[PDB]
Amino acid sequence: FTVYEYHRPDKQCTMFYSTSNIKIQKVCEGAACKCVEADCGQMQEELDLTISAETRKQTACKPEIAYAYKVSITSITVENVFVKYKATLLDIYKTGEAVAEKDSEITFIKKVTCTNAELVKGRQYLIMGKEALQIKYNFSFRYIYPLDSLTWIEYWPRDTTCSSCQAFLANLDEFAEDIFLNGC
């Protein structure tokens, strides 16, 4: 798709496209960026009563699982296939391949087809999925999470027992403790 001004013919502009649907896609604030396979999915409902804490352990124990933590959503970004979703890291359980210690506050990006996986700024949360693509325009792309399809997501209660009820947060604490003390 391209144009020039007929009254100013030096003023030429161009962009590249195709009719075929695209699936090899990731975007970054740098000269080379990673790629993902059209990645989008859906989150769980907030404050869910007596939800399956053992299923959270089974999900974190999966062979595809290599990101898993509890954090506060800090801020968001604008490039629509990878709106960055910055964080405030509270704890980690399987942050995985070539990762290190917590409180790094790094991105966990999102895409416009994943409408069922929306996130709230300032909100405490729990999630699981694959590890980051490890290179960028920086010396590393370390912990720049993809938040790809089939990943786990839910809200983390900021105050528990008056919220009807504390047993949901205690089940999530038991899931986190099982991943820390027995693992996979």
Binding site: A100, L181, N182, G183
Partner: protein
């Protein structure tokens, strides 16, 4: 890089290990991270948790139902023992059969406190010797 019994060093530096990777430690009594209640625990998992900044509390040798508090059967033996030939019971090893790295821990023996290896204390416990564990940390007894 700077590894340890509760640790897992990386990137040319020291680091903590996962409490689940510390799971094979000897079982003992312990207490809650913010309450007086007693419960079962393991020394390596409690050390890895403390290396992650998690709270913990000590307990006496009889203060909880720790799985390793007595001699086991064949096919499930702790690191201080193994199955005997053509027998369903497990047997306790000599202190020279220390294949595991182990912590060093404080225990009372012959009426006196002394530092020994976690595997040697496990052998004395499994063989029914009169012992009483006092901390998952070593004693003052080696001071000079």
């Amino acid at each position: 890089p700077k590894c340890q019994r509760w640790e897992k060093l990386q990137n040319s530096r020291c680091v903590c290990k996962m409490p689940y990777e510390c799971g094979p430690s000897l079982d003992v009594c312990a207490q809650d991270e913010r309450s007086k209640r007693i419960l079962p625990l393991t020394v390596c998992k409690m050390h890895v948790l403390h290396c992650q900044g998690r709270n913990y509390t000590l307990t006496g040798r009889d203060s909880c139902t720790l799985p390793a508090s007595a001699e086991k059967a064949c096919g499930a033996c702790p690191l201080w023992g193994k199955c005997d030939a053509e027998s369903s019971k497990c047997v306790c090893r000599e202190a020279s059969e220390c294949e595991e790295e182990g912590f060093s821990i404080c225990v009372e023996v012959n009426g006196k406190e002394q530092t020994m290896s976690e595997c040697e204390a496990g052998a004395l416990r499994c063989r029914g010797q009169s012992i009483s564990v006092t901390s998952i940390r070593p004693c003052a007894a080696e001071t000079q």
